[PDB]
Amino acid sequence: FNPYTEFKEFSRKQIKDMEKMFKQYDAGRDGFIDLMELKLMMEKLGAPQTHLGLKNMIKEVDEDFDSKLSFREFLLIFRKAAAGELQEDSGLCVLARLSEIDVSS
Ligand SMILES: [Ca+2]
Ligand SMILES: [Ca+2]
């Protein structure tokens, strides 16, 4: 997986920032963000989401159906944000917003 070739709508700086955020919250260092890790992320961003909200966030981008997020799937959150596909103030909209990445730039 070369993210730089799949996600050309983002600069190298933006992808590296997304990587830093991903790695920050992958507490277990296994290369994925699972439900509890995402729960902790949203708490720390200051916008805790409900259990179902969290589950639904993962479902929106969980392209290989394993119920956790790889880095590529994490980038899909930002791709969806940038494509105008996220519902206003849904959990993923909030994640992208509160993150240091502004996909509208
Ligand atoms: Ca993990
Ligand atoms: Ca997955």
Swiss-Prot record:
Where on the tree of life does the source sit, at the highest rank?
Eukaryota
Q: Which residues of the full protein are shown?
A: 80 to 184 of 240
Q: Which gene encodes it?
A: EFHD2
Q: In which tissues is it expressed?
A: Found in lymphocytes; preferentially expressed in CD8+ cells.
Domain EF-hand, by residue range, is: 13-48, 49-84
Q: For Ca(2+) 1, which residues are the binding ones? A: 26, 30, 37
Q: Which organism is it from?
A: Homo sapiens
Annotated residues that bind Ca(2+) 2 are located at 62, 64, 66, 68, 73
Localisation per UniProt entry: Membrane raft
> What is known about what this protein does?
May regulate B-cell receptor (BCR)-induced immature and primary B-cell apoptosis. Plays a role as negative regulator of the canonical NF-kappa-B-activating branch. Controls spontaneous apoptosis through the regulation of BCL2L1 abundance.
Q: How does it assemble?
A: Interacts with CASP9; with inactive form.
Protein name (database record): EF-hand domain-containing protein D2
What phylogenetic lineage does the species belong to? Answer: Eukaryota, Metazoa, Chordata, Craniata, Vertebrata
| Signal peptide positions on this chain | none
Q: Which residues carry this modification: Phosphotyrosine?
A: 4
